[PDB]
Design a protein around this ligand. Sequence first.
Ligand SMILES: Nc1ncnc2c1ncn2[C@@H]1O[C@H](COP(=O)(O)OP(=O)(O)O)[C@@H](O)[C@H]1O
Ligand SMILES: Nc1ncnc2c1ncn2[C@@H]1O[C@H](COP(=O)(O)OP(=O)(O)O)[C@@H](O)[C@H]1O
Ligand code: ALF
Ligand code: ALF
Ligand SMILES: [K+]
Ligand SMILES: [Mg+2]
Ligand SMILES: [Mg+2]
Lengths: 436, 436
Amino acid sequence: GLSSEQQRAFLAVTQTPHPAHLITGPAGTGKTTLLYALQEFYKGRAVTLAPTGTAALQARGQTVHSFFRFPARLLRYRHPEDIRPPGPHSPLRKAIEQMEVLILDEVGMVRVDLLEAMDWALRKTRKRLEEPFGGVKVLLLGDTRQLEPVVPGGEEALYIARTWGGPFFFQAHVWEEVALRVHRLWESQRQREDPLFAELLKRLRQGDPQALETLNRAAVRPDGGEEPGTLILTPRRKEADALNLKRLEALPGKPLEYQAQVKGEFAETDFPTEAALTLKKGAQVILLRNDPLGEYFNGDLGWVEDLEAEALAVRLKRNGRRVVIRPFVWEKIVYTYDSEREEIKPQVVGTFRQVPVRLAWALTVHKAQGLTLDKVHLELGRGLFAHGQLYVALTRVRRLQDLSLSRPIAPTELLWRPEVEVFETRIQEGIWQKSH
Amino acid sequence: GLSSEQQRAFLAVTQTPHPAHLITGPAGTGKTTLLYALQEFYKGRAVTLAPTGTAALQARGQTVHSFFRFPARLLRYRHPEDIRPPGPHSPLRKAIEQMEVLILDEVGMVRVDLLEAMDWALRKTRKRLEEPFGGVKVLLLGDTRQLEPVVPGGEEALYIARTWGGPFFFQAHVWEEVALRVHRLWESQRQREDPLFAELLKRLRQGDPQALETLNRAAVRPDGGEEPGTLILTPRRKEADALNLKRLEALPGKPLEYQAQVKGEFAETDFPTEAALTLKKGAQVILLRNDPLGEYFNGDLGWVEDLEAEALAVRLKRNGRRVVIRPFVWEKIVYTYDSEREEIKPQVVGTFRQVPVRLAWALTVHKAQGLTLDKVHLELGRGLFAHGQLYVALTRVRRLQDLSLSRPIAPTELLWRPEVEVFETRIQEGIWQKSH
DNA sequence: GGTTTGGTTTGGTT
Ligand SMILES: Nc1ncnc2c1ncn2[C@@H]1O[C@H](COP(=O)(O)OP(=O)(O)O)[C@@H](O)[C@H]1O
Ligand SMILES: Nc1ncnc2c1ncn2[C@@H]1O[C@H](COP(=O)(O)OP(=O)(O)O)[C@@H](O)[C@H]1O
Ligand code: ALF
Ligand code: ALF
Ligand SMILES: [K+]
Ligand SMILES: [Mg+2]
Ligand SMILES: [Mg+2]
């Protein structure tokens, strides 16, 4: 039951020889739902990828990293150590050579280096080094007014600025070779039954301070988090930890502590999960790693059923199956920048071994992007720090009734990237063409 | 090793249990050098703080603000919204509870609200409301004839006046509960090898008119700032900007401009650095914010190595390390007084986002307090405005030949605070105890 | 009619 604008985007995308399209629009316009119809249309022919585990599951695909086997680190431009082509008789080479279209959801969260590595990997594997993405038609979907890519500090941030001039997908050099045809969606599907709330979100997207003041007097209820069926969103992992502790201590089960093993240089701020992870039976959790056997993936929500030494059972929300979780290793990578040479080099400096589990009554705004949630409580904590973060938090629910805030938000807290503004204005013509 | 007067003050402070000491004396008597011996003596047990970034680095500690996590605004007396004890499991709580000695350098620049907030924060965290500083032994070092605390206009100035009677650290109500034992240093160490210049500085300290005339005859040389290896000191940031612009335009590198983003009420006189910051490779700079990763600090001097869109690399003077600088956000706080509540309230009215860098061939006198410099040129500009400003500028170097002035100084320019005079007189007795 | 003080957070894993 697609809408007039969705069916229009579908026809414009599926029924043209042009290899590079972008379907963009505000949160909840039905971009991912249009992606399902694209999956039904081509459907060996397509490969659906997303930047995050949560967005990957929402779109019924897998992460860009796990498909291409990219390392969890900076992907230097067309570097052979970072972008390694698959084996001569491997299933990955077979899928890449047989590929016809590639559907990339939540493209706003795809960092420039990741998009460039997808281009080069398809070119090297397909031996079509002259044409963008190896001749694969790319169907990109997302919203640059939602969360910007994650850029850590140090030499990695400097390399991105020097190579592309910024981290956004639209800053990739491939857009000099091919043009991006932009198809836009405007009608709110997620809040289609609350048109007043939809219009308030539309004004908040444009940074309207009157909208913000109205949001405050309508949604500020500090006790909204303690209500049933409510997911708490927070900017930082550490704040979700404190909120998840309260709900953990209220469970009647015996608790079991999972102690991590940390080696070399690994800072506690960098831990994917708690070093002393306490869990109880019945706890809401989210999984952080893909199962090597394929039973669970990064982003899978579920509930603890059994707690044992170095092993626990989780009942998945996605399919109601029972999966057993064992410890995984995480590498900490640091970038050195040799002085005599013009080059940057990665090096592993420490490891973290722990069960890939995190309590999931409270989650970061990053883990929520793409989801339609029944009820959300935003805990501001020490404040908003990423562009698009507040917008993502507020647009997850269908009705204004389903949303609550821990405290009022000031207009000075709203972040805006000028690169996004110039992009959003140039694509109003319908084409994104890069300069140089 | 220490001089005999430094050794007497070292023993006086370390062999008595008395919890509050002040080591004071003229510029360059070796207060901070004695502080180093105190760090060696105490030394898991001591935390070293200072009000400014440059003074913190010289003392090998950190700012008071960064340690206690105080906001960069007026700290209302024992106000819960301004003075927030750390969380139950925070590393800062562990540090405060384990702390035995707090060493506070450049205490003369510590504003009364800052000192009081330290006292209250220590009482609250350690849960000893009845002991000054929660039972921590405090060792203060500084000089009240050097720069007075910074007090911007408006309601913030009126609040300090009403609450404490003025801005100085010695006007803190904590001194009504514990006596401050005073230890004096007299021998110049910085100017040890130039005894006539040390004698001139001493007479300038006492406002001697004949000393000022002797200084004007020897030191006035307008072209002194162009001589190699010279740091220029100016009273105002905008005066330093103009002097920095001249030296920068002589570097051969290609310029790069960092454009600040300003939103809401901000005005240019409050900008921490230029809105249109021009940089070149090789430019001498000072960093204005602490790295969240800990590689660099507010006050760190260095030189530009790389210049990219939103990122630069600076080579630190302090350790020869290369650090990557990204934009930071600053807030503007105004205090509104409300009808018939005798209370003020803070509010964020604007933000300024910019790379935390300033050109550093010319610096403000405030940024020089605590340093020993090889060669100084004081550009008077529009004139002296703060108590102690001229004295700090003149006492940075070891020898008279190392100092030059842009123009002669008239006696009507010398500033004096009566609050300082009554304090300097009472501490001749060896004790300071606030009455009433 | 001026000067000082403050965190880089979040995602990807064969
Ligand atoms: N044409 C449609 N008719 C009815 N419901 C829709 C339609 N398109 C999307 N939805 C619903 O709206 C919600 C948000 O859609 P989604 O595709 O997740 O939006 P986006 O990807 O743009 O955020 C989902 O619950 C989805 O089922
Ligand atoms: N006892 C000493 N012997 C030799 N040099 C000293 C001694 N005390 C201080 N200095 C040097 O004299 C200069 C000023 O000392 P410093 O401790 O910074 O003074 P203050 O903190 O009193 O302004 C510094 O270069 C310091 O190394
Ligand atoms: F744009 Al969405 F969930 F995919 F708001
Ligand atoms: F008193 Al100083 F450098 F700390 F002159
Ligand atoms: K010790
Ligand atoms: Mg979606
Ligand atoms: Mg000193």
